[PDB]
Symmetry: D2
């Protein structure tokens, strides 16, 4: 079950009572699979995973995996503050059929390289499925060097993949060189989708497939076809929307976008606010011109 191409981040719809709206989540999942995504990645920032209580988190994982029905690989974000809880969530995700889990070293205080390494070792040694190492300083507060990342990949059996969202293309260049092309890496930063693929990215994790699965998939196809000129055209066409998502927030824009697409998924959980009227109209236009 190769993990590649367009990997769709799922959102977490909330019901009026503020609780989970699973039915809506199932529809969004079906919308993604039919949109032609190559995998599903639940409980990331897009899904406001960190806003969920433990019961809610468990329920979302369960429902998502049951819904997907192994039609495409599922990579669950199991990142948490403590090693114990990260391990526990990784084991839980595996027990329900997750093909892989993603681990970002989130922390409020700085972690040293030894502490980061052991964190990944503990998670990998506790499970039987692959772990995707996720480097995102902007959100986690930690910035792992390519050297450290490569040591974790080599020394930790289950750590096999690397996602980069630093926005710094040089990180992927170093991964390619120092990894000698044997360490598969993935793109996590939307505005760099084109460059990421050109640099050799095996896949692109994004919430955009929630709104424009077709354009996203065409970009990946163009790269596979080695069509440099077409890929550029496709990228610049969808870039504005990509910039807007980063600009106004993932869950904020995605949930609003799905709402405009006739799919009621409610609003984000406070303190995150729903897209305002002005932003909603602008998004409306962006989507109409892309369609």
């Amino acid at each position: 079950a190769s993990i590649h191409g367009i990997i769709g981040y799922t959102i977490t719809p909330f019901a009026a009572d503020g609780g989970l709206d699973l039915p809506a989540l199932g529809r969004s999942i079906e919308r993604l699979i039919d949109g032609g995504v190559h995998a599903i990645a639940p409980l990331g920032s897009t899904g406001e995973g960190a806003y969920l209580s433990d019961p809610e988190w468990d329920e979302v994982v369960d429902f998502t995996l049951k819904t997907v029905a192994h039609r495409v690989p599922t990579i669950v974000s199991v990142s948490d503050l403590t090693t114990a809880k990260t391990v526990r969530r990784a084991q839980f995700a595996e027990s329900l059929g997750a093909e892989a889990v993603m681990v970002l070293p989130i922390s409020y205080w700085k972690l040293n390289e030894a502490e980061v390494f052991q964190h990944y070792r503990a998670v990998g040694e506790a499970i039987g499925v692959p772990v995707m190492l996720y480097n995102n300083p902007g959100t986690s507060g930690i910035d792992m060097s390519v050297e450290l990342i490569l040591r974790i990949v080599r020394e930790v059996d289950n750590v096999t993949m690397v996602k980069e969202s630093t926005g710094d293309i040089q990180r992927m260049h170093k991964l390619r060189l120092l990894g000698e092309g044997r360490v598969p890496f993935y793109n996590g930063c939307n505005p760099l989708a084109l460059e990421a693929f050109v640099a050799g990215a095996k896949g692109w994790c994004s919430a955009a497939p929630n709104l424009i699965p077709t354009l996203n998939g065409q970009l990946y196809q163009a790269v596979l076809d080695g069509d440099l000129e077409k890929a550029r055209a496709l990228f610049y066409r969808q870039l504005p929307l990509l910039d807007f998502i980063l600009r106004r927030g993932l869950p904020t824009t995605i949930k609003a976008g799905l709402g405009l697409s006739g799919l009621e998924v409610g609003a984000p959980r406070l303190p995150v606010q729903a897209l305002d009227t002005e932003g909603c109209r602008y998004l409306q236009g962006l989507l109409e011109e892309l369609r």
Copy 2:
């Protein structure tokens, strides 16, 4: 009761992995005996974020009971969701907290409107003062002085501001733009001296766990307006403050307490206990202070 001077951050001892409340009680007594003007539980020092909800609730209750209002207690109630932050603020208040501290935590940027409303929600839910805490290094959110002042003036219960950016200019602005009416507090150890001279009303630190005497003397020297003694006292303790910063609060404080006759275990993974080499260096720093 005025919140001022030396405000001691408590650590959270762990036993078997669970809480070691008896050890916590002992550490709290030390701090109060040590002359702290207030207690601040469940901050970064106390690894608050590593605690389960049940553990957090337990620590809050136990801490408040132990202190027994001998000094003011300001509880860190910050959490990701507004709903949870509000709940923790009300919980702390109901259990006797004199004040609460709120830091806008988020694994993704929040806009000024989202931040402002976050504080408004918390302030309106309680009847005790809120200390607004700006620490982008640990929170990922950096609030401008202008925004901070808007929150202080518009939200009744938000009355105090803690700065931990390490950027003294933030305090200068708070001083000028707030026209000296907005009390601010220092949360950055290596800036203790400058913060006080800039007008800081208090200093929130975990250092009192190890050197409560030098900490208190620095504050007193400032109160006495004795610039030269203050400078001397600060530089004498600076090396230790620098070390705490480089090697981590919970890591260094828990290690240091072990050297001071108080076993409090190790930090919670992925944070690791101070290594042998670091521990030896710490022993040297404390000796030299002596």
Copy 3:
């Protein structure tokens, strides 16, 4: 027309430390034989800022004469004052320069209004195109895309934009906001591949002094739309591009030419010549690419 591989020239010095024009001539011949599409003299690579006014004037003259218009020449006339920048731009034009490049160098921040008039003054003072060059790392000034676009659209002679921030997003924005009308060039070696794919019309580099073949091949592959071949070619030469940036342009390029049978001396102090270790590593890198 400026496109493809624009080769930055170095400025050879004799043992004494003075100009070595013969060697410069040989290096220019190596570049043109190498297949460069343009020559860019007196940039950072050429240690332009290190030259006296007389030395600078002579290098420009000798360069333009040696080239004999076989390929376009774009002279870097950037200087601190507007008056001297204008003078240098006119001197270059009077000697046949096809165009000039202007970077807003300053030892103190300049405001957007000051930057704009600087370019306006230069543009209105000459009759050849001006390439606006944004390089914060080497200038101390970072021009916004909107500012750059405002200068290009309002200043007749300002027609081209060079980006050296290493931030691909700047080029994306130049593409969208410029609507594909504003031709931009890459000035950052390790971004050659991405820059071309993003829409870069040319790549100004000192690398052509060492590996003009691999350089041109990368450009040609992009012209053909061969994404895979381009990637392979880029990564093959990247190690060298990384080394140059890490050890210094003039330092590595002068050491490289030495190992390429073209003695060009060392950099002008305080810049030091490549050391033994770095020299052996560069030697290994080159032998592998050839």
Copy 4:
């Protein structure tokens, strides 16, 4: 003669015809001395040193030293791109009686620690007067660690003083601790004037004395008197002006300020522009408030 207290940066007035206005420069120097500065520092950023031709630079040095008539020490900024020219300027300054020189490692291209050390070594060994090592990454593009600075100071005889303009008070803490209080350091960052003195700075180099020498001097005196309360008050009273100078630029605000103070000194050299009407209005208000 000790270099301490308030060291006044001079501006370089230009005549209507673009050339040097020596009479105006003389008047500004007298104003500084009468204002109670403890030293004069010509040809820094305040004086637009880098904007001057060689003949102009030489003349300003000559005229300045003659005007001062050794009433107070003069520390000339001799920093230049090449080691050769920096040495020449240092020697020229000394030949005309300069008490000391200041050296900042200017470089468009980055420089390594070895290159920086040798630069100072060359300058120090070429002259017979003290050198003030000046760290200002914001201007030079180079950021010398305190460790490197202390090595230079210890190993190069004539390098005896350190000026810090990073705005990072911790650098001064390190200089005091690692230097064991035997390496005199100076403040070059206006809005850090109070903290620098509190940290133990021996002197403060500023262009502010051109406008408010009295308040500048009073702050220093309060620090000497150990009066924490008064020092704080004096600093905050003048901070708005210090903030403004930094925000609007040295030559710009200083030359505009002197004009508002009855001393016509022309405008800065392009690309630097004169203070705008709105700025002049604000500045006039600040000065009237302080006087």
